[PDB]
């Protein structure tokens, strides 16, 4: 691995956004791991969009708590509606998140990349591990907007897979 690809835990296109994203992540994920995910209903735009993707059982393999949700546009000799399993409206989005099992995200695992930071909009990507209270690796991207003197998720795309086993052991201790 070169020094142009050696992993850094986080990158910020604008350092000013760091505290904003920090405040956002803390509140969001505490609520998310609270089990009482309905409160995230205020975190999502009324016309927000959210979808969840994962690799197949031959590839991943087994994510049966999550396969209900998989929206994967890549098809090979299999056409479903493009609107299938895409959630429109804060109600569907937070409901979908509420249908998850209980989770324990390890912020020590997180990577955070803020790639767009302006008055109108923020785009940041978070990857990490969470325990299914089995360990899953996640990568979520948030497109967040200002709304009534506060932040608001307009678009969220979620990827989920199984973690490597040595991670599972390092997390086990």
């Amino acid at each position: 691995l070169g020094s142009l690809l050696e992993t850094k835990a986080s990158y910020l296109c604008d350092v000013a956004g760091a505290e904003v994203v920090r405040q956002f992540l803390d509140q969001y994920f505490r609520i998310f791991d609270s089990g009482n995910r309905q409160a995230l209903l205020d975190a999502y735009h009324e016309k927000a969009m959210l979808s969840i993707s994962m690799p197949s059982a031959s590839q991943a393999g087994r994510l049966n708590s999550f396969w209900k949700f998989n929206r994967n546009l890549r098809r090979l000799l299999n056409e479903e509606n493009r609107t299938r399993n895409l959630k429109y409206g804060r109600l569907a989005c937070v409901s979908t998140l509420d249908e998850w099992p209980k989770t324990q995200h390890d912020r020590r695992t997180f990577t955070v990349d803020l790639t767009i930071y302006n008055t109108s909009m923020m785009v940041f990507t978070v990857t990490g591990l969470f325990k299914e209270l089995d360990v899953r690796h996640f990568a979520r991207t948030y497109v967040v907007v200002p709304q009534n003197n506060g932040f608001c998720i307009r678009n969220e795309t979620i990827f989920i897979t199984n973690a490597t086993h040595e991670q599972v052991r390092e997390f086990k201790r």
């Binding site: 690809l5 990158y11 890549r74 990568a139």
Partner: protein, 128 residues
Amino acid sequence: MDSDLKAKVESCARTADTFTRLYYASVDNRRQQIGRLYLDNATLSWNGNGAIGRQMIESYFQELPSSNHQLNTLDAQPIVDQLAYLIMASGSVKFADQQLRKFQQTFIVTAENDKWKVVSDCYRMQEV
């Protein structure tokens, strides 16, 4: 859901499919021309390594080792707030010459003169 936005959703899925295929082809096999896929002021972040501007992104790519990306999942969303697409891709990558790694990549593409170009590129890879 508007009829309009069912249209936009499907528009977005198609453009996602084609942009991704061209993109990964160009990263693996035609890096000299990779800058074509980026707006002049796009921002790239590969594993936390940032690059501001198309020219620095080009430079960055020419300095990376040879790669082979295998795409597995593809997801995409229209962003309405000119139009932009949020794209989430995942697969496995072979960096010449190391072990196989897995990767997730988030794009925001937007259209310039009827051609889709990156606004934001976030790339994160993991072991195994």
